[PDB]
Design a protein around this ligand. Structure first.
Ligand SMILES: COc1ccccc1Nc1cc2cnn(-c3csc(C(=O)NC4COC4)c3)c2cc1F
Length: 346
């Protein structure tokens, strides 16, 4: 008679509704554990993420409350949608965990980057990323923390973006990934819409190079790998920095920056036919417009969707979407509990 049952997937206890059967682990981020299962009601396979007590601290509660509201507020083919929310607990006092159900995908973008892709599939994945990004901007949402681990794909090359970005001490052993954050985020300078274009550039470069473009233990090593490859930024970008961080960055050794045919040689691109030779140059051209330190010179999302390497998928009903207030604050763990609990009850 109990409409719930408990399964032990790895070390986490998955207490889900009886409609979800055959639970199997598929992924693991930092906010919860994800499982695949068969939804006996909808007759389809779903992905279930379990958020263990998200009100336990401010970082977990701010992120959980954020993505819980936006996923019923924003819809798109390239932005993941909510299928069902539930908690096995009955009252606010007993409230513990939140389970998010979404349509099951086939792989992470990290698994796809490890593969060798043609120009058709690379351009299509990059087209779907810019479509969902522009819908986020159309809804007044800027990500600033795009990364392959939060992007899922299917075998038919369909792409969807999992999370909604940044708004922070972490009491956890798992470290966050910062290799894809724009220089303005690395140095704290303020941003516009095109801050996510940089993250697209690091991903697109990684699909070609099969190596993290700007690795490092901290922002100290990361900014080094940026200027050692793209070059020391121009003084107009310099003066836009805060005086403290402007001094440190200006005091670094000056680099001319390697050219883009050198950062991405032709041997890394499908270059056997004439059509493949042209697409390799168009791809490298999009890398040149996206991977630039200065945001004022950086290409925008709308201009990237019209780039020759991308606009082969251009379709008006697919690019844009309707545009659908502001709940940013600081609460206690008890206040955060009720705020998240009522969002689950809806
Ligand atoms: C509700 O979820 C969320 C909501 C909000 C933010 C994040 C999430 N997390 C999240 C969602 C999804 C959907 N798909 N995958 C997936 C990766 S790999 C694979 C697979 O191996 N599929 C094979 C087995 O049958 C084909 C399937 C996910 C992995 C995830 F971490």
């Amino acid at each position: 008679d109990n409409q719930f049952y408990s399964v032990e997937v790895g070390d986490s206890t998955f207490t889900v509704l009886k409609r979800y059967q055959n639970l199997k682990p598929i992924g693991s981020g930092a906010q919860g554990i994800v499982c695949a299962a068969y939804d006996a009601v909808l007759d389809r396979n779903v992905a279930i993420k379990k958020l263990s007590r998200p009100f336990q601290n401010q970082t977990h509660a701010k992120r959980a409350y954020r993505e819980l509201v936006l996923m019923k507020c924003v819809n798109h083919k390239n932005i993941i949608s909510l299928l069902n929310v539930f908690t096995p607990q009955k009252t606010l006092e007993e409230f513990q965990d939140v389970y998010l159900v979404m349509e099951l995908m086939d792989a992470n973008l990290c698994q796809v980057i490890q593969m060798e892709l043609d120009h058709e599939r690379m351009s299509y994945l990059l087209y779907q990323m810019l479509c969902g990004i522009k819908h986020l901007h159309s809804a007044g949402i800027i990500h600033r923390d795009l990364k392959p681990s939060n992007i899922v794909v299917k075998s038919d090359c369909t792409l969807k973006i999992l999370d909604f970005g940044l708004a922070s001490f972490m009491m956890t052993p798992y470290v966050v990934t910062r290799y894809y954050r724009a220089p303005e985020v690395i140095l704290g300078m303020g941003y516009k819409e095109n801050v996510d274009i940089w993250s697209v550039g690091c991903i697109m470069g990684e699909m070609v190079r099969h190596k993290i473009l700007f690795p490092g233990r901290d922002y100290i090593d990361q900014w080094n790998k940026v200027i050692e490859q793209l070059g020391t930024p121009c003084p107009e970008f310099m003066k836009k920095l805060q005086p403290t961080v402007r001094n440190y960055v200006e005091n670094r050794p000056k680099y001319a920056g390697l050219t883009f045919p050198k950062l991405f040689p032709d041997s890394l691109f499908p270059a056997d036919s004439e059509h493949n030779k042209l697409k390799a140059s168009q791809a490298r051209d999009l890398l040149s417009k996206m991977l630039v330190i200065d945001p004022a010179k950086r290409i925008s999302v709308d201009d990237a969707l019209q780039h020759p390497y991308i606009n082969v998928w251009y379709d008006p009903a697919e690019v844009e979407a309707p545009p659908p207030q502001l709940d940013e604050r600081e609460h206690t763990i008890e206040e955060w509990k009720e705020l998240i609990y009522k969002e689950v009850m809806n």
